[PDB]
Amino acid sequence: MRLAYVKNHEIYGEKLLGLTLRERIEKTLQRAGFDVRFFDELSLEEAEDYLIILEPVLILERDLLLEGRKILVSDGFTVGYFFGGDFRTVFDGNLQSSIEKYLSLNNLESYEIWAIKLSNDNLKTAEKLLLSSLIKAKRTGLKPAYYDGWIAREINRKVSLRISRLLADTSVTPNQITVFSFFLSLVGSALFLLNSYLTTLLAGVIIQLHSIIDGCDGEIARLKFMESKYGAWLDGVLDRYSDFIIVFSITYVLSASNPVYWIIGFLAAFASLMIAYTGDKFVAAYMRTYSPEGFAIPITRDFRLLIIFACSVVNLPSLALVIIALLGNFEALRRIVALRS
Amino acid sequence: MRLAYVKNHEIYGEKLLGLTLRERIEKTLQRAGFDVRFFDELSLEEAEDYLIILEPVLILERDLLLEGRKILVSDGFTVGYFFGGDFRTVFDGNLQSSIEKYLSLNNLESYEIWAIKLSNDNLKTAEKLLLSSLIYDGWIAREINRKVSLRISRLLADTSVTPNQITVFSFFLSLVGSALFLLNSYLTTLLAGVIIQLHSIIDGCDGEIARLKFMESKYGAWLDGVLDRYSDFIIVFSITYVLSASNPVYWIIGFLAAFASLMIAYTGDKFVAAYMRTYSPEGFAIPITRDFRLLIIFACSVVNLPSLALVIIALLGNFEALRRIVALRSYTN
Numbered sequence: 305m306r307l308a309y310v311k312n313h314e315i316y317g318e319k320l321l322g323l324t325l326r327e328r329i330e331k332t333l334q335r336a337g338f339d340v341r342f343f344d345e346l347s348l349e350e351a352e353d354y355l356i357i358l359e360p361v362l363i364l365e366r367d368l369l370l371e372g373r374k375i376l377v378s379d380g381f382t383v384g385y386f387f388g389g390d391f392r393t394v395f396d397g398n399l400q401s402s403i404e405k406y407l408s409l410n411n412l413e414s415y416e417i418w419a420i421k422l423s424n425d426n427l428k429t430a431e432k433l434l435l436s437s438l439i440k441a442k443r444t445g446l447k448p449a450y451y452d453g454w455i456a457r458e459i460n461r462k463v464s465l466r467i468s469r470l471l472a473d474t475s476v477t478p479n480q481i482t483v484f485s486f487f488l489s490l491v492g493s494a495l496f497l498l499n500s501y502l503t504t505l506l507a508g509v510i511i512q513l514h515s516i517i518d519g520c521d522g523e524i525a526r527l528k529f530m531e532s533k534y535g536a537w538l539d540g541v542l543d544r545y546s547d548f549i550i551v552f553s554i555t556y557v558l559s560a561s562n563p564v565y566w567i568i569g570f571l572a573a574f575a576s577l578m579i580a581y582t583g584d585k586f587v588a589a590y591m592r593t594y595s596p597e598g599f600a601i602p603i604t605r606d607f608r609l610l611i612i613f614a615c616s617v618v619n620l621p622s623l624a625l626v627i628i629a630l631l632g633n634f635e636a637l638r639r640i641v642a643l644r645s
Numbered sequence: 646m647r648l649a650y651v652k653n654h655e656i657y658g659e660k661l662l663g664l665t666l667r668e669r670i671e672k673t674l675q676r677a678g679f680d681v682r683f684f685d686e687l688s689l690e691e692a693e694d695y696l697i698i699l700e701p702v703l704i705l706e707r708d709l710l711l712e713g714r715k716i717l718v719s720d721g722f723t724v725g726y727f728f729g730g731d732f733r734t735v736f737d738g739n740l741q742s743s744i745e746k747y748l749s750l751n752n753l754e755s756y757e758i759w760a761i762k763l764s765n766d767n768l769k770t771a772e773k774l775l776l777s778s779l780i781y782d783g784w785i786a787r788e789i790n791r792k793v794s795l796r797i798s799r800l801l802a803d804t805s806v807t808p809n810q811i812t813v814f815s816f817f818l819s820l821v822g823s824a825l826f827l828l829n830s831y832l833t834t835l836l837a838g839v840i841i842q843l844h845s846i847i848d849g850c851d852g853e854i855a856r857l858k859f860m861e862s863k864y865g866a867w868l869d870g871v872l873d874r875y876s877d878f879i880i881v882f883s884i885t886y887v888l889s890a891s892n893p894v895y896w897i898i899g900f901l902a903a904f905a906s907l908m909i910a911y912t913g914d915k916f917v918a919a920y921m922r923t924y925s926p927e928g929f930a931i932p933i934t935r936d937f938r939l940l941i942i943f944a945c946s947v948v949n950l951p952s953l954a955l956v957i958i959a960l961l962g963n964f965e966a967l968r969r970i971v972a973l974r975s976y977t978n
């Protein structure tokens with residue numbers, strides 16, 4: 305057992321995006337493999353190692369790892385103390401005194417973690433920072449199946465986080481958002497079938513809306529510690545259905561004009577699925593996140609749906625199929641070659 | 646460090662399916678996290694734990710785990726001894742005496758492992774058992790296809806052929822089958838179906854040879870799956886393209902059949918990605934895994950109805966995908 309001692313503060317009682325700051329630090333530390341102990345005066349229990357947090361803080365880091373005794377720091381400011389089990393041999397019943405003693409007996413290195421020390425004034429700042437930590441990127445500490453693409457990170461996340469902020473105060477669950485996001489893709493697909501510029505235009509808009517909202521399910525999940533294995537599975541599986549159904553609807557309509565589009569449609573659908581499959585198969589076989597180091601063709605899902613959007617507003621959904629089919633299939637082949645090395 | 650002491654025997658020099666029995670026991674124990682030491686007379690080195698194998702044996706178990714002192718047994722027969730580090734406090738330079746001493750000081754529980762004690766006559770028996778140990782397979786794969794592939798892998802074992810080469814070669818066969826479909830004649834459709842089934846069988850050999858010769862790799866596992874997605878797509882696309890000339894409606898059935906094939910694979914691999922365990926339904930599941938899909942294509946092709954295969958794959962495949970979505974709601978998260 306590992307113990308995390310967190311000094312009580314009146315500000316921990318304030319709610320930030322659905323959860324009190326008290327449960328947030330509690331769950332983050334629990335995730336990190338610590339049994340949590342809130343205290344006013346500290347009585348020491350036996351454990352392998354000790355984490356001590358004296359000042360009120362919001363931890364933003366997601367995959368916190370503490371190996372070896374060190375001082376945890378946020379931008380030069382001490383966030384907490386991580387001592388070894390031998391701290392028991394120094395503790396004298398006074399926390400202030402004991403920390404001074406233990407620190408003098410050692411030379412602890414500083415260790416940077418993403419966190420914000422909390423004040424009565426900077427809670428608006430903490431909200432924005434907490435939201436920004438919800439994105440699938442390396443800076444946050446998350447270890448997903450894949451990281452957000454450029455379109456996702458700089459465009460879609462900007463909108464979805466604003467939506468998730470409003471959803472945080474509700475009882476809406478990630479799975480519900482996932483299903484709703486999937487349903488939106490069907491609305492977009494149905495609009496394509498009506499075969500008119502207006503409905504084609506509306507479809508593209510809704511497909512992009514779907515692309516954005518499909519980020520909210522993951523955001524709320526990470527934001528409220530409601531992540532789940534099934535949720536992760538469902539989120540992905542339905543995205544394959546969406547990609548397939550969207551391309552089918554566009555292909556079916558275009559086939560009325562020229563049957564050749566069946567082939568381009570077939571190739572576009574396959575590409576979309578294989579970009580997903582190559583990445584998820586990598587995770588399955590390597591048991592680590594898929595992430596290209598250098599050159600990669602920007603044809604990840606965030607790009608594919610933006611392309612469908614952009615092409616749809618100019619009434620050329622066929623061009624999106626061509627682009628996805630070409631860029632997508634070459635990217636799939638590229639991954640095969642790149643992984644050989 | 647954990648040390649595995651294996652007493653030398655003349656039989657370890659014999660070759661079984663491409664590798665000497667000496668190399669096989671060495672590699673198997675290394676996989677299990679042991680440093681191996683072959684010996685005539687035993688001199689003891691310091692280590693966390695000790696594994697002692699006195700009689701010549703071929704280990705068939707794949708995921709051997711040794712936690713806590715035990716005697717390793719195969720059908721009542723002692724295969725080896727697994728002693729704690731405290732064996733150092735008893736060893737007196739004589740192996741027989743030291744083992745006798747340590748065994749009398751303890752009360753070792755027995756622990757069953759899959760293995761066969763080796764002799765000069767039962768090597769044919771060891772070959773069959775080793776081959777059988779190479780095979781989440783569907784019923785068709787396990788009871789039909791494996792029967793043929795193991796016989797092929799047996800011949801491949803004596804060669805320098807790698808798993809990746811078999812995977813790519815298998816992928817090539819699927820293209821030949823697809824090309825034959827495009828020629829639009831019963832004969833070529835019949836030949837196509839046969840090659841698709843041959844492809845299905847040989848697609849088991851890459852995994853067999855990999856496990857048989859300890860040549861498993863992450864990229865190999867990745868490639869094995871990815872190219873099978875390519876094969877499934879190209880086969881269905883090829884059948885659909887020809888059939889579309891008669892009735893364009895088959896484009897829709899083809900799209901649904903291709904999608905189904907890909908999603909049966911994706912749902913399974915995505916499960917592994919999210920749950921980090923093998924996908925395996927406890928009870929009922931619609932038999933439309935790859936071994937079934939390709940047999941259906943084969944069976945329908947010999948009677949010149951490849952269109953029926955698309956319908957069947959499209960129907961059973963999509964319902965199975967949907968079934969998995971609903972079934973997984975149960976015990977997960």
Ligand SMILES: Nc1ccn([C@@H]2O[C@H](COP(=O)(O)OP(=O)(O)O)[C@@H](O)[C@H]2O)c(=O)n1
Pocket residue numbers: 440448449478479480482518519520521522523525530531532533534535536538539
């Ligand atoms: N219903 C859901 C949806 C996502 N998640 C989690 O969030 C991750 C996906 O985040 P995301 O939705 O922002 O990713 P994208 O689909 O936008 O690319 C999944 O892998 C899950 O870990 C969940 O737990 N339950």
Ligand SMILES: Nc1ccn([C@@H]2O[C@H](COP(=O)(O)OP(=O)(O)O)[C@@H](O)[C@H]2O)c(=O)n1
Pocket residue numbers: 808809810812848849850851852853855860861862863864865866868869
């Ligand atoms: N070129 C290859 C092919 C398979 N393998 C391994 O063998 C497994 C596949 O076994 P298999 O080919 O007998 O059965 P299938 O999964 O292909 O139906 C892969 O998951 C790999 O662990 C490999 O390492 N390299």
Ligand SMILES: [Ca+2]
Pocket residue numbers: 482518519520521522539
């Ligand atoms: Ca999502």
Ligand SMILES: [Ca+2]
Pocket residue numbers: 482485518538539540542543
């Ligand atoms: Ca989704």
Ligand SMILES: [Ca+2]
Pocket residue numbers: 812848849850851852869
């Ligand atoms: Ca294979």
Ligand SMILES: [Ca+2]
Pocket residue numbers: 812815848868869870872873
């Ligand atoms: Ca394969």
